[PDB]
Amino acid sequence: ATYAQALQSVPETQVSQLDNGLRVASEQSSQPTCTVGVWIDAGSRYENEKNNGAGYFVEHLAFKGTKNRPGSALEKEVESMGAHLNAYSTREHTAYYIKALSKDLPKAVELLADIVQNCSLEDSQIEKERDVILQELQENDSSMRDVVFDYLHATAFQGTPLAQSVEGPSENVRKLSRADLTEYVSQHYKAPRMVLAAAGGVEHRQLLDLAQKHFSSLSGTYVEDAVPAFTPCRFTGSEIRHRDDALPLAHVAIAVEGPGWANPDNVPLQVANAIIGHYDSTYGGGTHMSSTLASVAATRKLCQSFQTFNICYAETGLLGAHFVCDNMSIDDMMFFLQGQWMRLCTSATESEVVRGKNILRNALVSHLDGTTPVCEDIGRSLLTYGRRIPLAEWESRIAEVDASVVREVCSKYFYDQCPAVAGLGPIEQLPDYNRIRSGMFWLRF
Template identity: 65%
Template sequence: GGGGGGGGGGGCHCHPVRRLPRSRCLLSAPVLGKRGAASYAHTLQNIPETQVTTLENGLRVASEESHQPTCTVGVFIEAGSRYEDAKTNGAGFFVEHMAFKGTKKRPGSAFEKEVESLGAHLNGYTSREQTAFYIKAFSKDMPKVVELLSDLVQNCALEDSQIEKERGIILQELKETDSNLTDVTFDYLHATAYQGTALAHTVEGTTENIKKLTRADLASYVDIHFKAPRMVLAAAGGISHRELVDAAKQHFTGASFEYKAKGSVPDLPRCRFTGSEIRARDDALPLAHIALAVEGPGWADPDNVVLNVANAIIGRYDRTFGGGKVRVLGVQQGEPEAFSSVGKLKVKWLTVSPYLQNQSSRLAALAAEHKLCHSFEPFNTSYSDTGLFGFHFVSDPLSIDDMMFCAQGEWMRLCTSATESEVTRAKNYLRNAMVAQLDGTTRVCENIGSHLLHYGRRIPLEEWDARISAVDAKMVRDVCSKYIYDKCPAIAAVGPIEQLLDYNRIRSSMYWIRL
């Protein structure tokens, strides 16, 4: 994601046996009738409160207690590729790999074996502004899990032999990433939109950097970023906050919180958005990947909620979703030539045109009916002080122009004529996605850790619901106009993209000439 989409555009490393499944199920609509609405409101009001305690060294300890047999405990760190320079880009991703390969206390595979002995799952990821390590285990093992995580972030061994072994693994991963055209497209999008700034860096780093990074580079990265005030210890599940704080005091009190040299405290590098493009034409590829984005708001900006509603109106589409004109078996009436024989009956096939199966958005309906693309998805990727708001689609070479025309037309429609009915539908979709965050301890734990790093507090779902409820069609039109209308976009295109129009032609579709 994420980046994500989301969050957004982050690399991930985890042991292949330990990848945690992510639930993709959607809950039923929360506002169907009085009983459903009351149940939904009751659910929001009865979510356990997030408790937060700050230790003397600046480490924030946060938890949400629930009566479950399992828990997820994680360490979320304010570190990522945005804090790297051109020479050290990739260090954070390299450190994440090394964190699973033993500590000073548990060398080699001893760390992973101890996690396995608990029947637990270990996972981690690195993004542009955040790094996380978390373990899902039985609730009774929470103190042991806290001790394991403290060992992982405070005593990473960084053995020379393991570094060389992981170097080869990461280089192989980079080759595999190059074959994932969606990831490549989004990396290009960041590279052009934030050219000359730290957000242009990929999370994984360059092949050249991975070959050159030394143990000293990795140790320096850990020493600078793995400081207590930059970390959040978050937990969710069948745990006690008091016991979590006690375990944190026991194992994280020694976490460093001081910088030896003046000026060594890492600052968030300033970034700027540049309307521009990168085109990587390769006619040997079967499909074109296109991403177009304007500059969006940072994490804490209230406009984010409105833009998420706008994206829900646009919707998403994949050919596997089905869709197309609905043929209805009708009662005999009308002209004879409109009928066909089915058995002994004369029946009429009614073609119902704008109503399409499984397609509630206009753009999805157009894509399905006219076969404009294989898939498309809008995104709103936020960072501390900026973001990327746009859409990504995959299409046949001869459909690029039509798909771009329809997608930009949908943007212009949102800016000028978004309706209350589609805003209501989009708000219900967002509410469903929001309530889905209650599903499982891992998602709640990630939510707590990310919120404390991004907002400085855990925003309750009840507050999110109030923000969503406050959005109306006028807000959607105004906010979309603010970020989209007559703005210079960033464009990334990969594959057989000969039909992609010149940048200035695409730029000229970012506004309508109206009287």
């Protein structure tokens, strides 16, 4: 049995639609558990400065009660069958999913149709969630990576809705009335924006027939005519430096404008990112790692950690690198990161592309282990691609990358481009923006 023949035997994702436009998608297995959820085309990029934070607030209030399950009846019902009710919001998506036994799918879908459609949004629970969201803001400030990536978004997408954080500034959380939160759900929690995904021991026909008795009153109509529309987000080469020498380590995120989701350049770029890879000081192979930046950082103790990232949105993205290091090593970290970028742009070699493609295949297959990653894969894929891209198609797209492809795409996105830079902490030795900008081309080239 060959990896190629295992990809073909990976089961199919059935997709069926309701009249309201709700899209129902499921990957069946023989597992005795399942993960069913609702993925909505919602996030803070659809929020303006007035209501920024409303989606995170609605997520906060989602499980706190509905018109039929008063406030903790929902929690007792989910708990008494051993299920797990999670939620998450990003700048572009919002998910509500349950991990249940396969026999509990009818109750799991009935729980989500109630939650996504009939949140009481009670005036008394909004005040209680204010203090939590305010406290969670302070808990968030303590995470330097979250701060530095919010900073990267704020400077990269300045002037646009994508600069906003999901949570919103701690000025709107105290002002979001019930009417705001009611309006956010009335504008964004619609069937044509919603995907009902399942994965595990779930038959598609039965999930369909549950959706068309629980979600079938989820309209896609907008008050009078006021349907919200898409707004593209300008990228800005820019810098945001938050200098705080009391913090023991510096966090540096640097990104160029990357492709949106449906751009095939994503596959060659992810490959190339696998060439730079990622490092942590607790790794192992260390100085013998194939990634040049990893081996230099391990040999010289240049950093505590570094990662490559490709964050995608509908029409743009952030393609770059985040590293944590001490105040006297930022310069070397930036030098070697930009040198590796330039070396991929100009002189990627076939063997490192083979290893990078190997890494990408392994990351894609290992990621999809379990019902919950598959359920999120289905929901997010229908929101971003309008379909589920099979692992066979991912393999076919990876098989087409070579060193020439990597050189051309890394040239297009990295070479002689202006990056957004976020620095937090003891960042006095983080290079000046002209010096970082000069690191995006080579004079030898």
